[PDB]
Amino acid sequence: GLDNELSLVDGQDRTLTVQQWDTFLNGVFPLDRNRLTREWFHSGRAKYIVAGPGADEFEGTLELGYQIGFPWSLGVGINFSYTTPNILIDDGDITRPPFGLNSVITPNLFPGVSISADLGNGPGIQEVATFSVDVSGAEGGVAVSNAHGTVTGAAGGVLLRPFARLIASTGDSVTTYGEPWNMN
Amino acid sequence: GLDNELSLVDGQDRTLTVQQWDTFLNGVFPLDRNRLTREWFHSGRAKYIVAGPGADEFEGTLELGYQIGFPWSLGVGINFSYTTPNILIDDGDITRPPFGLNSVITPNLFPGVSISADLGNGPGIQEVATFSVDVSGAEGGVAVSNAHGTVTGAAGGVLLRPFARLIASTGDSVTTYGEPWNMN
Amino acid sequence: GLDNELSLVDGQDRTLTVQQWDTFLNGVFPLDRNRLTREWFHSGRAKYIVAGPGADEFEGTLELGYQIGFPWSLGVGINFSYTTPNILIDDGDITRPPFGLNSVITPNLFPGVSISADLGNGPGIQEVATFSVDVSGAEGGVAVSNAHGTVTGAAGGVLLRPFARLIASTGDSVTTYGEPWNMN
Amino acid sequence: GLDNELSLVDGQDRTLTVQQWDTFLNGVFPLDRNRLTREWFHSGRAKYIVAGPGADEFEGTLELGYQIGFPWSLGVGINFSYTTPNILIDDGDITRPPFGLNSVITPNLFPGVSISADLGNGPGIQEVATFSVDVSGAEGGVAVSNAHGTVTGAAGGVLLRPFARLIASTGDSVTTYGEPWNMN
Amino acid sequence: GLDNELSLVDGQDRTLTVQQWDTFLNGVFPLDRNRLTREWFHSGRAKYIVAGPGADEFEGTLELGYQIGFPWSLGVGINFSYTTPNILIDDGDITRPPFGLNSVITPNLFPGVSISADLGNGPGIQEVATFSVDVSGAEGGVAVSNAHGTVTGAAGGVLLRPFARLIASTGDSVTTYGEPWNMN
Amino acid sequence: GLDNELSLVDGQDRTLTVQQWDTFLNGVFPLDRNRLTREWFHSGRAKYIVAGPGADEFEGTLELGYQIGFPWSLGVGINFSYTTPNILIDDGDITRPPFGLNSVITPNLFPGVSISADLGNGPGIQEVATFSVDVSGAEGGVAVSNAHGTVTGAAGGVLLRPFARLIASTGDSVTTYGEPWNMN
Amino acid sequence: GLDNELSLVDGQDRTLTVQQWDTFLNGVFPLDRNRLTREWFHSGRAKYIVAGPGADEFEGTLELGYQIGFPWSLGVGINFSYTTPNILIDDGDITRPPFGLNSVITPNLFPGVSISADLGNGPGIQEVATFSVDVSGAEGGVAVSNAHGTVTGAAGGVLLRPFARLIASTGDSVTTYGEPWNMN
Amino acid sequence: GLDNELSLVDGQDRTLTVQQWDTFLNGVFPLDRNRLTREWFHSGRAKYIVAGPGADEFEGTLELGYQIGFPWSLGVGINFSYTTPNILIDDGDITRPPFGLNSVITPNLFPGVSISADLGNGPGIQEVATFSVDVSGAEGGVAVSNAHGTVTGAAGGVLLRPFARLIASTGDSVTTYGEPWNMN
């Protein structure tokens, strides 16, 4: 049904209304099985109405999309390393027995694994446009089912804020916002 | 209502007036729940008037926007690391017992976390144009409701200064400035 | 046969149906004989139907493809090194015998090999379009046999999710998704 | 009023005069509250006169702007860091009590802050064009009120030198310069 | 003769057949005499047939080429170095004889050579198009003799998989693959 | 007056003459008050004459400018740093009093300033074109007053060599050079 | 005279012949007197013939060039350095005579030169096109005298393999190869 | 006068002759007074003659220029540095007098200068085109006086090899070379 709506008396006395219908953000288990990944499908409709002078020769653009935000970037690195046995002489006496072999340095003698995880402030708030298209005339107009979206390297919970926007060819714009959906 | 206004007698004797109406910069809790992020919605109208010779065949551009300034950039990094037990021989004697095992170096024996926060001078003062469009004739013209803006990696308070600008196709320009809004 | 299907009543009352037929993602032993490489062949058909007003003057785009996800990036590096024998004097006395040769540093005395493997979080979820083409009229339309796909530096299992997409010239879109195929 | 003026007998015997009127560079407290930032508003008019043969079919370009110079770049960085307690064994004996725990290295035991400020020779002298536009005919033409300008990372005093320039379509040019304005 | 063939009933009921004839991949001793280099000459023909409705007004693209894969990248570096004799005083006493010359550090006393070879996972599977050209009508069409191909920095054996591809202007595609040729 | 002149009998028997008149390179105290900056104003005229066959339908390009050279690049960097008091234990015994506090490392105990100046060979000899424009017919043509030029990071004296150039649409060219002006 | 030749029955039954005549690759002592540089002059002619249906309305491209290969890249670096005398106190006692001057570190006391030569695997096999031009009709067509080629940073001998190529506008191609010329 | 000449019977039986006349490369003391810089002025004429069928409707390109080569790149860097007096405690006992002040590290106690010069193999052989222009008809055509050229960072002597080139619109080319001029 109708999720949300906003109206604007524009700069040439037209009433511009933009609406969001049937919005669904469907979070799924990530294809990559990566705990830092989020993945979802966006369905919904954007509609517009224009009333007042010139209503029928209205030219504009209609968009549907979402903003996304999460607090931290996270990366994880795991290293395996091994180095074959060796010796270098360090502060050794090579003039007489045992020729500096009483003062050697070796590499690490065993194979080893190390892990390193980095957490930093996130990339901020981003905007995705599911569609952005030309419309004309007083009413319309556009619907989407099962558009795909994803983000990775994310931690602390991913929030998605759906919007619909109408921009008049004339410069005027109104956008309506919905309640956010939690991908965590 | 009318927020602010400015007039200019231009280079061919036209009086150019640009105005800001109904301005609202609405700071909200950030979608990304990041203390270094600020997020807001811009509403307002820009109007112009042109008087004197040629008024009716005026060609121009109308803009509405804001400048943003904050004093410091801030970044935060937290690292978790652990390395598997190992030894290397350092200045050891491999000719006789105990074959240098009386002088070893190991990696850190425990898992460890470290935090690093960097504060530096900020990126200076930036300008955003919420809309910038062609206008013609003596009066107009353009309105916006709930346009979105954001910035991250910011500290010490974010200030937003709203403006409206009129540029004549002829080169002349006047811009009016409003009272700043505090996002912190 | 028919694998999967989805319908949408669009923004101007047309019923848009997109379908996936005969889908085969054929994983093969990799040409490069690299355990971090995966390689496959994509076959299938995408069909569409449009019903309701204007059905016959429908303009659109039809795509067939897949998303790919795997959890980890992996890289492996093996180094062989050898350095010719040398000495430098370190904290040596050059005023008297044996002129500092009782305190030398050498390079590693033997040839050596070392291995280093790095595992990190993967690149997230990617989309590939096997074909994306213009279609017009009420029904169609497009088939592919043995298109090639590949990815390398991958670990933890590669998953492929096939889709078909129909985008109306009018902005409306519907995409249908199939059951994923395992390349590991 | 008239601030400054310059004339040139050009390459085809036209007298070209360019003038600066009503120039004001208004330094303000920086929106970003950053001591390395300067911010100002430029108002003024540029006029031109062309006399001699062909005066009425003169084609050219008119500009108004300023050069900016300051002696030093300055940046400031403040780091906070803390690392969780740890030990590695350094030149320790692991064959017998106390197993090398008599020779350990730790990280810094306390949290710490460090500051680093860098001062270097500045970026040199830069030119900003407030407007740059086509003019035609013997007289004109162009005015600006409250154009915005800023610079950051600056130290040692910021000077602004206003100019007006006329370039004939024919190649000839004259520019007039004003007295500089101090932003510190 | 005919090496391999594949057919497809396309999205508008045309039968599309693509074929590979007379394929020869001729591996030669590399011009650069570099053991990490492979070099070869590709000869062959691609043909196509289209049957069913509209056969004679078929528009498309014909390609011939190969995929290449090898498991490892390899690089080798050899350094020669020598440094002229010198001394620095390290932890020396300059208040009394012999003024710290009893505790010096020198550079390496001899000339030296070191070798370093790096082996890492390879670049994955790549595609080369020997030709890719427009065709029209029901049958054709294109042949190549002695086209050149090469790759360097390769180890573990280089495999080359020949293909021919037909893409209809309409989106449909079929590609046929041959048996791979070993460049090692 | 006339500064300098050069003539060329070109490839189709036209005599091409290019001349420099009234040349002034006016060095001023730098706007940025930076000892590594030089700043100046260029005034002058370039004239051409063409004689012989086709003189009146001559098409060309006329330029006026200078080359600049200085021997050294110079940069200066001054750092202020301070680090808060801390300790780490280095080769300490943590099994018994005083728990390694008899062997600590600290950061620098005082605030500190350091200066670093780098002198290197300069960027070589550069060419600036004050104007470069199309001319037609047997005589002309172009004049400039108070064009601006600058350079920074310079040491050892900045030299400016003025020139005028005429390029025929036919490829032929002649350039005349003046006596250099010293900006140091 | 005729150096080499190759024929192909193409995809529409035309016999395509490409030929190399009078080929000379003239190695000279390098202008830069650099032992890692090679320099040469290429002379030769490329001819084509087309027989069978449509021979006279043949459209194509004719090229002449060479491939170049050498086994190793080589670079050489020589550094001169000197540092003015200095001291720092290292593990010194500043509470009592001689105030740590019994334990100083200095820089290198003498001026010094060091040389570093790096040999690595070469850049592989490259192709240069001396000319590549449009041809039409049954026979032609193109000749070159003393075209220049060069390469630097090369070691182990530079080999040049001359070719001529004919590409039909229809996609078909044949290339003929000559005996290689040694630039070392 | 005539310096050098070369002729070619081209691919369509035209005799193509290209010539160099009046060539002068005038080395001067470098404007930048930099010993690694070379600077010169190029004067000369290129002529061409075409004989045989179609001579009068010949279309082509005429160039005049030089190759440049020198064996070494050279760079020089001089650093001045000073650091204000400081102390850190190294392996000090802070539990009892004198609290680790018996084991300190300082920065260098004096101001210091260091020089570093790097010599490496040169950039190879480069080509400059003084002019490159369209010509038509059987004879011409183009002359240059006092064109400027320069290079810096050079050592071991700079050689300049003058050439003239004629390229037929048809692909054919001949170039003639002169005796080299020494800029050292």
mmCIF file with all atom_site columns, N, CA and C in Angstrom, chain B residues 120-143:
data_model
loop_
_atom_site.group_PDB
_atom_site.id
_atom_site.type_symbol
_atom_site.label_atom_id
_atom_site.label_alt_id
_atom_site.label_comp_id
_atom_site.label_asym_id
_atom_site.label_entity_id
_atom_site.label_seq_id
_atom_site.pdbx_PDB_ins_code
_atom_site.Cartn_x
_atom_site.Cartn_y
_atom_site.Cartn_z
_atom_site.occupancy
_atom_site.B_iso_or_equiv
_atom_site.pdbx_formal_charge
_atom_site.auth_seq_id
_atom_site.auth_comp_id
_atom_site.auth_asym_id
_atom_site.auth_atom_id
_atom_site.pdbx_PDB_model_num
ATOM 1  N N  . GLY B 1 120 ? 43.704 15.670 12.677  1.00 0.00 ? 120 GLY B N  1
ATOM 2  C CA . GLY B 1 120 ? 44.413 16.683 11.910  1.00 0.00 ? 120 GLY B CA 1
ATOM 3  C C  . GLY B 1 120 ? 43.536 17.873 11.516  1.00 0.00 ? 120 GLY B C  1
ATOM 4  N N  . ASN B 1 121 ? 44.159 18.975 11.087  1.00 0.00 ? 121 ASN B N  1
ATOM 5  C CA . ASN B 1 121 ? 43.421 20.121 10.563  1.00 0.00 ? 121 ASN B CA 1
ATOM 6  C C  . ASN B 1 121 ? 42.471 19.670 9.456   1.00 0.00 ? 121 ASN B C  1
ATOM 7  N N  . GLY B 1 122 ? 41.277 20.274 9.398   1.00 0.00 ? 122 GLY B N  1
ATOM 8  C CA . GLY B 1 122 ? 40.195 19.854 8.511   1.00 0.00 ? 122 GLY B CA 1
ATOM 9  C C  . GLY B 1 122 ? 40.357 20.219 7.049   1.00 0.00 ? 122 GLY B C  1
ATOM 10 N N  . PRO B 1 123 ? 39.434 19.763 6.208   1.00 0.00 ? 123 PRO B N  1
ATOM 11 C CA . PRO B 1 123 ? 39.571 19.973 4.759   1.00 0.00 ? 123 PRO B CA 1
ATOM 12 C C  . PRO B 1 123 ? 39.261 21.404 4.258   1.00 0.00 ? 123 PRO B C  1
ATOM 13 N N  . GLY B 1 124 ? 39.010 22.347 5.163   1.00 0.00 ? 124 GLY B N  1
ATOM 14 C CA . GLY B 1 124 ? 38.656 23.711 4.792   1.00 0.00 ? 124 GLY B CA 1
ATOM 15 C C  . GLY B 1 124 ? 37.159 23.865 4.512   1.00 0.00 ? 124 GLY B C  1
ATOM 16 N N  . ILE B 1 125 ? 36.786 24.907 3.770   1.00 0.00 ? 125 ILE B N  1
ATOM 17 C CA . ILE B 1 125 ? 35.357 25.216 3.552   1.00 0.00 ? 125 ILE B CA 1
ATOM 18 C C  . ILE B 1 125 ? 34.876 24.805 2.169   1.00 0.00 ? 125 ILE B C  1
ATOM 19 N N  . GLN B 1 126 ? 33.864 23.949 2.132   1.00 0.00 ? 126 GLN B N  1
ATOM 20 C CA . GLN B 1 126 ? 33.352 23.396 0.879   1.00 0.00 ? 126 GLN B CA 1
ATOM 21 C C  . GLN B 1 126 ? 31.994 23.985 0.478   1.00 0.00 ? 126 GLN B C  1
ATOM 22 N N  . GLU B 1 127 ? 31.687 24.013 -0.822  1.00 0.00 ? 127 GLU B N  1
ATOM 23 C CA . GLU B 1 127 ? 30.365 24.445 -1.302  1.00 0.00 ? 127 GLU B CA 1
ATOM 24 C C  . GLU B 1 127 ? 29.564 23.337 -1.995  1.00 0.00 ? 127 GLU B C  1
ATOM 25 N N  . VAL B 1 128 ? 28.322 23.148 -1.541  1.00 0.00 ? 128 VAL B N  1
ATOM 26 C CA . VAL B 1 128 ? 27.396 22.212 -2.169  1.00 0.00 ? 128 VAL B CA 1
ATOM 27 C C  . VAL B 1 128 ? 26.253 22.990 -2.842  1.00 0.00 ? 128 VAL B C  1
ATOM 28 N N  . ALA B 1 129 ? 25.910 22.596 -4.061  1.00 0.00 ? 129 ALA B N  1
ATOM 29 C CA . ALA B 1 129 ? 24.772 23.162 -4.788  1.00 0.00 ? 129 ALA B CA 1
ATOM 30 C C  . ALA B 1 129 ? 23.588 22.176 -4.792  1.00 0.00 ? 129 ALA B C  1
ATOM 31 N N  . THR B 1 130 ? 22.591 22.417 -3.936  1.00 0.00 ? 130 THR B N  1
ATOM 32 C CA . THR B 1 130 ? 21.364 21.611 -3.909  1.00 0.00 ? 130 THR B CA 1
ATOM 33 C C  . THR B 1 130 ? 20.633 21.585 -5.281  1.00 0.00 ? 130 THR B C  1
ATOM 34 N N  . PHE B 1 131 ? 20.561 22.730 -5.970  1.00 0.00 ? 131 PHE B N  1
ATOM 35 C CA . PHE B 1 131 ? 20.143 22.777 -7.385  1.00 0.00 ? 131 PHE B CA 1
ATOM 36 C C  . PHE B 1 131 ? 20.794 23.971 -8.052  1.00 0.00 ? 131 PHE B C  1
ATOM 37 N N  . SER B 1 132 ? 21.005 23.860 -9.348  1.00 0.00 ? 132 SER B N  1
ATOM 38 C CA . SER B 1 132 ? 21.563 24.934 -10.142 1.00 0.00 ? 132 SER B CA 1
ATOM 39 C C  . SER B 1 132 ? 20.921 24.798 -11.532 1.00 0.00 ? 132 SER B C  1
ATOM 40 N N  . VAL B 1 133 ? 20.041 25.737 -11.896 1.00 0.00 ? 133 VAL B N  1
ATOM 41 C CA . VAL B 1 133 ? 19.201 25.614 -13.099 1.00 0.00 ? 133 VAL B CA 1
ATOM 42 C C  . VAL B 1 133 ? 19.019 26.901 -13.895 1.00 0.00 ? 133 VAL B C  1
ATOM 43 N N  . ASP B 1 134 ? 18.739 26.728 -15.182 1.00 0.00 ? 134 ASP B N  1
ATOM 44 C CA . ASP B 1 134 ? 18.446 27.807 -16.104 1.00 0.00 ? 134 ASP B CA 1
ATOM 45 C C  . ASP B 1 134 ? 17.091 28.438 -15.823 1.00 0.00 ? 134 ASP B C  1
ATOM 46 N N  . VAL B 1 135 ? 17.060 29.766 -15.830 1.00 0.00 ? 135 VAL B N  1
ATOM 47 C CA . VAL B 1 135 ? 15.810 30.530 -15.715 1.00 0.00 ? 135 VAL B CA 1
ATOM 48 C C  . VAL B 1 135 ? 15.812 31.602 -16.787 1.00 0.00 ? 135 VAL B C  1
ATOM 49 N N  . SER B 1 136 ? 14.628 31.974 -17.278 1.00 0.00 ? 136 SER B N  1
ATOM 50 C CA . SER B 1 136 ? 14.457 33.144 -18.175 1.00 0.00 ? 136 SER B CA 1
ATOM 51 C C  . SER B 1 136 ? 13.256 34.030 -17.815 1.00 0.00 ? 136 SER B C  1
ATOM 52 N N  . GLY B 1 137 ? 13.280 35.288 -18.259 1.00 0.00 ? 137 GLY B N  1
ATOM 53 C CA . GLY B 1 137 ? 12.232 36.236 -17.898 1.00 0.00 ? 137 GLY B CA 1
ATOM 54 C C  . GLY B 1 137 ? 12.436 36.957 -16.566 1.00 0.00 ? 137 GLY B C  1
ATOM 55 N N  . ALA B 1 138 ? 11.516 37.869 -16.252 1.00 0.00 ? 138 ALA B N  1
ATOM 56 C CA . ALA B 1 138 ? 11.694 38.827 -15.156 1.00 0.00 ? 138 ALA B CA 1
ATOM 57 C C  . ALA B 1 138 ? 11.542 38.339 -13.703 1.00 0.00 ? 138 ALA B C  1
ATOM 58 N N  . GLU B 1 139 ? 10.858 37.204 -13.476 1.00 0.00 ? 139 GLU B N  1
ATOM 59 C CA . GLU B 1 139 ? 10.605 36.657 -12.125 1.00 0.00 ? 139 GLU B CA 1
ATOM 60 C C  . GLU B 1 139 ? 10.517 35.124 -12.102 1.00 0.00 ? 139 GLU B C  1
ATOM 61 N N  . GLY B 1 140 ? 10.850 34.535 -10.939 1.00 0.00 ? 140 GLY B N  1
ATOM 62 C CA . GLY B 1 140 ? 10.890 33.092 -10.664 1.00 0.00 ? 140 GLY B CA 1
ATOM 63 C C  . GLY B 1 140 ? 11.495 32.897 -9.269  1.00 0.00 ? 140 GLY B C  1
ATOM 64 N N  . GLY B 1 141 ? 11.581 31.673 -8.754  1.00 0.00 ? 141 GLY B N  1
ATOM 65 C CA . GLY B 1 141 ? 11.284 30.522 -9.542  1.00 0.00 ? 141 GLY B CA 1
ATOM 66 C C  . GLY B 1 141 ? 11.467 29.131 -8.995  1.00 0.00 ? 141 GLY B C  1
ATOM 67 N N  . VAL B 1 142 ? 12.339 28.871 -8.024  1.00 0.00 ? 142 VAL B N  1
ATOM 68 C CA . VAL B 1 142 ? 12.551 27.436 -7.695  1.00 0.00 ? 142 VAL B CA 1
ATOM 69 C C  . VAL B 1 142 ? 12.665 26.965 -6.237  1.00 0.00 ? 142 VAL B C  1
ATOM 70 N N  . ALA B 1 143 ? 12.056 25.809 -5.961  1.00 0.00 ? 143 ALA B N  1
ATOM 71 C CA . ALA B 1 143 ? 11.827 25.328 -4.601  1.00 0.00 ? 143 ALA B CA 1
ATOM 72 C C  . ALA B 1 143 ? 12.296 23.875 -4.421  1.00 0.00 ? 143 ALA B C  1
#
